[PDB]
From a paper:
To comprehensively visualize bacterial translation, we reactivated ex vivo-derived E. coli polysomes in the PURE in vitro translation system and analyzed the actively elongating polysomes by cryo-EM. We find that 31% of 70S ribosomes assemble into disome complexes that represent eight distinct functional states including decoding and termination intermediates, and a pre-nucleophilic attack state. Based on these observations, we named the ribosome bound downstream — closer to the 3′ end of the mRNA — the ‘leading’ ribosome, and the collided ribosome — bound upstream closer to the mRNA’s 5′ end — the ‘queueing’ ribosome. In the following, RNA and protein components of leading and queueing ribosomes are labeled with subscripted letters L and Q.
To achieve a detailed structural analysis of an elongating disome complex, we focused on the most populous state containing a non-rotated closed PRE state as 70SL, as well as a non-rotated closed PRE state as 70SQ. In line with the corresponding population of total 70S (closed non-rotated PRE), 70SQ is in a post-attack state after peptide bond formation with peptidyl-tRNA in the A-site and deacylated tRNA in the P-site. Due to the obstruction of the 70SQ factor binding site, binding of the elongation factors EF-Tu and EF-G is forestalled. In contrast, bL9Q is found in the compact conformation with its CTD bound to uL2Q, bS6Q, and 23S rRNAQ H79. Interestingly, while bS1Q is present in the disome complex, bS1L is not resolved. To further investigate bS1Q in the context of the present disome complex, we low-pass filtered the 70SQ map and docked an AlphaFold224 generated model of bS1 into it. The filtered density readily accommodates the two N-terminal bS1 domains and extends further towards the putative location of bS1 domain 3. Comparing our structure with the VemP-stalled and SmrB bound E. coli disome, we find that the bS1Q NTD of the functional disome occupies the proposed binding site of the SmrB N-terminal helix.
Author numbering:
A (entry chain w): 1 to 93
B (entry chain l): 1 to 46
C (entry chain b): 2 to 272
D (entry chain p): 1 to 18
The structure:
Amino acid sequence: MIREERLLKVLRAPHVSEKASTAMEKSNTIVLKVAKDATKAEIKAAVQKLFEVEVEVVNTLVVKGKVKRHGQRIGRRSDWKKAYVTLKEGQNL
Amino acid sequence: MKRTFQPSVLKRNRSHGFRARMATKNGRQVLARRRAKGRARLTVSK
Amino acid sequence: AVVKCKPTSPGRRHVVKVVNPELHKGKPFAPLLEKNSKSGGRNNNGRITTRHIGGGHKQAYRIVDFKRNKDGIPAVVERLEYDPNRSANIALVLYKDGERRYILAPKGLKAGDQIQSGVDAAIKPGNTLPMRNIPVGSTVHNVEMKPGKGGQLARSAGTYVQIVARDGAYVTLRLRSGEMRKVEADCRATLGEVGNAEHMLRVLGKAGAARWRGVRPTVRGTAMNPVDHPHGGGEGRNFGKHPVTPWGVQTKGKKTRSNKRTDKFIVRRRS
Amino acid sequence: XXXXXXXXXXXXXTASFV
RNA sequence: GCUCGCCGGAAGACCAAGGGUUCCUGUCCAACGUUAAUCGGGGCAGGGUGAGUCGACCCCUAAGGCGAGGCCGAAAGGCGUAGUCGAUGGGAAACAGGUUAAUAUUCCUGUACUUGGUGUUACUGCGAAGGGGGGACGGAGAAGGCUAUGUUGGCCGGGCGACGGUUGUCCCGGUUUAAGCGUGUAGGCUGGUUUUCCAGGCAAAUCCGGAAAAUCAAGGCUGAGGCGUGAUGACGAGGCACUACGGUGCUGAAGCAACAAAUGCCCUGCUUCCAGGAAAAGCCUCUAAGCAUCAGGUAACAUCAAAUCGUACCCCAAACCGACACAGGUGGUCAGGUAGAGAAUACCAAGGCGCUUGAGAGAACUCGGGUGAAGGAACUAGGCAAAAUGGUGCCGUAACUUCGGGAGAAGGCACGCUGAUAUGUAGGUGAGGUCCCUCGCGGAUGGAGCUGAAAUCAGUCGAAGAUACCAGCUGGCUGCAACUGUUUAUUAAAAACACAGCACUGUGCAAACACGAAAGUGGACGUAUACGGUGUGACGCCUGCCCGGUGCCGGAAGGUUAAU
RNA sequence: AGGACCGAACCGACUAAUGUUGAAAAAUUAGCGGAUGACUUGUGGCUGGGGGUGAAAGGCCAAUCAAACCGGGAGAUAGCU
Ligand SMILES: [Mg+2]
Ligand SMILES: [Mg+2]
Ligand SMILES: [Mg+2]
Ligand SMILES: [Mg+2]
Ligand SMILES: [Mg+2]
Ligand SMILES: [Mg+2]
Ligand SMILES: [Mg+2]
Ligand SMILES: [Mg+2]
Ligand SMILES: [Mg+2]
Ligand SMILES: [Mg+2]
Ligand SMILES: [Mg+2]
Ligand SMILES: [Mg+2]
Ligand SMILES: [Mg+2]
Ligand SMILES: [Mg+2]
Ligand SMILES: [Mg+2]
Ligand SMILES: [Mg+2]
Ligand SMILES: [Mg+2]
Ligand SMILES: [Mg+2]
Ligand SMILES: [Mg+2]
Ligand SMILES: [Mg+2]
Ligand SMILES: [Mg+2]
Ligand SMILES: [Mg+2]
Ligand SMILES: [Mg+2]
Ligand SMILES: [Mg+2]
Ligand SMILES: [Mg+2]
Ligand SMILES: [Mg+2]
Ligand SMILES: [Mg+2]
Ligand SMILES: [Mg+2]
Ligand SMILES: [Mg+2]
Ligand SMILES: [Mg+2]
Ligand SMILES: [Mg+2]
Ligand SMILES: [Mg+2]
Ligand SMILES: [Mg+2]
Ligand SMILES: [Mg+2]
Ligand SMILES: [Mg+2]
Ligand SMILES: [Mg+2]
Ligand SMILES: [Mg+2]
Ligand SMILES: [Mg+2]
Ligand SMILES: [Mg+2]
Ligand SMILES: [Mg+2]
Ligand SMILES: [Mg+2]
Ligand SMILES: [Mg+2]
Ligand SMILES: [Mg+2]
Ligand SMILES: [Mg+2]
Ligand SMILES: [Mg+2]
Ligand SMILES: [Mg+2]
Ligand SMILES: [Mg+2]
Ligand SMILES: [Mg+2]
Ligand SMILES: [Mg+2]
Ligand SMILES: [Mg+2]
Ligand SMILES: [Mg+2]
Ligand SMILES: [Mg+2]
Ligand SMILES: [Mg+2]
Ligand SMILES: [Mg+2]
């Protein structure tokens, strides 16, 4: 949580779903895609330092990949971890 | 009517799981045979 | 007292119970409890090695002081308690220094009696003394075979042995089986008979009572098939085969003792 | 597009003793 | 969308196990769906599960598994100690409201709680791989006090009726509020407080267990529920405005009482019985060694931390186990109204569905039903089947009997509705008021108001009043087995097996015996009033004679006889 | 009080019909027996093939049992078709 090297690989991408848009408008919560092995703590430190924003709490969930077919071949989407990071009141990104 | 297979993951892993098979040499010989045959799924563990 | 129940229902018609109001009706002494898991008559290989064992009510084991080595300390019987692990009743004794223990309750024992152990104890029921110091002809019970090992003979309800003679370091005892045996004079024994002498008068009355004792049904060999038991079956009810056992050993008379190490102590076998 | 076949068979009838 | 019908102790709702995206939205109709399909649990593309207080995990153990060394075994290996694992059990803590197309005790609002770390301050005997307590435990039964919940009344809002009447004792709807905190109630359990001694609790112990003495008429522990607070809030019928049928925003009345009532709570209680009913840890306490300036303990603030994993959806089923979208199977939780003893049954509420082909026709024949003149088992291997009986109260009830039974023996009578006794009865519940209190969630009177059998008499309609559903056919002789029970999963449920009881026999405990090349284990932490084996099979009266044959037991002189 | 009575859940499976290329590789409908107990059930655990287990039917041991299943000896052997 304290190493700048660990933090720079924790955040993978922002989530741009309809739920994420509602989160921007209603509860000032940012939805991110993080490393599958990441813990709520380190994620709070990385966002606080790399975005200069105050974080209230971070809840995480694991999304199970979907099973799809490419032609006649079976395949599976990868599992990923979704983090709901709630920013302190007032601050905006 | 109650059919023969009543699934249970804990029972399934404790009976035929990788660690149950490898506990004894005879089970380890099962793994050797399945490795020689080239099985994609060595044991029943997920 | 032995009381027979009136036949208000089949299965109660023949039940005869032995009710002793003097037994403690409360809970046992907690510090003396330990687990006694059931076995089902199955050894560490998991096979049944003794048939007709299984089920029954769960029972806890009571640590009974079979050594009686608190010499010189008087003890007083607090109460008599029922013990599911044996046919006899047990007695919770309280020594004068505060130690509590469970002992077998002799015939005439009652609450408030005073017991004492040691070489200088009086010869009275409930007292434990080395058997060299007990007059010949006395009636004793819970007799130890080896010094300090603990009592092993005549421990079930109503049993006892007789000291018929003493000769040097050995005595000759008449056991309940009627055999005359030699036991080292330094062994201890408890004066008097074992209590609960009316135990043979109880009638359990129904199959469920035996199931409560952990006794499973016994199937007669003549009712089986030839593949299962030597007595086999045959059309209808046919026997025609000198009695045997599920493993071929002749029953109904054939002796099986072969020790060669303890026969030196048997001066006359039972008859 | 992945059809298959299976057959176990069972045995029973009457008597032919006369 | 409006009707109709079905389930409603389920064909509703929530889970576990198991499945694994089947969940939601858009789009498409090749294949899949036993038909068509615009639809789908189908194809495609996006989206969707958020936990200090829910589980898993973590601490703790049961059966049992593994097992350093060890013991044993040709090898492999077997068993097993210390240990270490292993829930189906024991251990800290969160509730209500709102919100998404799909998640919510996980998200927002409001209000709480728990366990650790750190710091400050004050007061300070701490401390174990030890010791004690506690945790901690059965079956059955009986009530009493409660709540969930329901009913009625009151209150609030709306209504004055598509055809007779309906401003009325009328109609419809609503009348909801948690955890937490305070109080400690009904009630249950236990005498309490000091001082003293002591070979016990592997050493010590101030603790536990003991002995004595003194003094107190009390003290302590546990525990429902209610009430207050939480809550000037939230919720709330409905309302007006906007708008994409959604919705969104604002406002918002009453929000009480009585009665009935659990299979839920007090209750892990009480009473009783024999078949005599886990463990460990957390927790409390006690001291050893090792520190007693310290450390550490207690208390109050402040503060950090509570990670990781499951979380969609199905879950008596179209998503699980059955090759099927298969009339099967599958553990737990929830338990509305009327009638009823009831979770039976019938009709309904909330809620969910009409079973993935239908449309005609109205033959034989088949299936599932309904009714039947006269007769009434003449049918038939055999009253199979069907029909008949069926409830409550009361009267009455034989041989025989082990005196319990047989017995619901048989057989019969009365059951609706209305009024009166009595504008609701006996009973139950019980406010106000009035006394008393060392004073409260108090006691005694008191009877208002609600709830309520049951009987008799009179009248009254029906062909039938236990009117439907629901719901014993009965009796006589006899064989067999005493009985309850068990059995051929899938053609046999019996007279077969078991059974209590009886007898014989073996077995002296390093027991016989059994499983094991063995160690060892079971027998049994049992000891002849015990255990194993065999046969018989409650109970009653009994079980006669034969030891030649075959076995078994005892004897040992002689004859015969192996290895050596 | 009761291996007591009656009768739901629940367990069981006696009679009959239907089903027999089934709704189904043992079911359904109307009945039927037990239903505080030798009861029933969930979750784990143990016993392994001449062995287990069996209130005993040669029953059960994964739609299989007078000796399971899988692979090997193995192309057993087959005076038979
Ligand atoms: Mg999570
Ligand atoms: Mg026996
Ligand atoms: Mg017998
Ligand atoms: Mg037979
Ligand atoms: Mg056998
Ligand atoms: Mg034989
Ligand atoms: Mg014969
Ligand atoms: Mg209906
Ligand atoms: Mg109902
Ligand atoms: Mg029903
Ligand atoms: Mg799951
Ligand atoms: Mg799919
Ligand atoms: Mg859908
Ligand atoms: Mg089609
Ligand atoms: Mg789809
Ligand atoms: Mg070893
Ligand atoms: Mg659990
Ligand atoms: Mg949160
Ligand atoms: Mg109430
Ligand atoms: Mg009109
Ligand atoms: Mg009950
Ligand atoms: Mg959910
Ligand atoms: Mg849902
Ligand atoms: Mg189905
Ligand atoms: Mg279908
Ligand atoms: Mg027709
Ligand atoms: Mg007619
Ligand atoms: Mg007609
Ligand atoms: Mg006729
Ligand atoms: Mg007629
Ligand atoms: Mg006739
Ligand atoms: Mg004829
Ligand atoms: Mg005839
Ligand atoms: Mg008939
Ligand atoms: Mg009928
Ligand atoms: Mg009937
Ligand atoms: Mg005859
Ligand atoms: Mg019978
Ligand atoms: Mg007889
Ligand atoms: Mg059985
Ligand atoms: Mg059969
Ligand atoms: Mg059966
Ligand atoms: Mg049958
Ligand atoms: Mg017999
Ligand atoms: Mg005879
Ligand atoms: Mg009964
Ligand atoms: Mg009956
Ligand atoms: Mg039926
Ligand atoms: Mg029935
Ligand atoms: Mg019955
Ligand atoms: Mg089979
Ligand atoms: Mg063979
Ligand atoms: Mg060949
Ligand atoms: Mg060969």
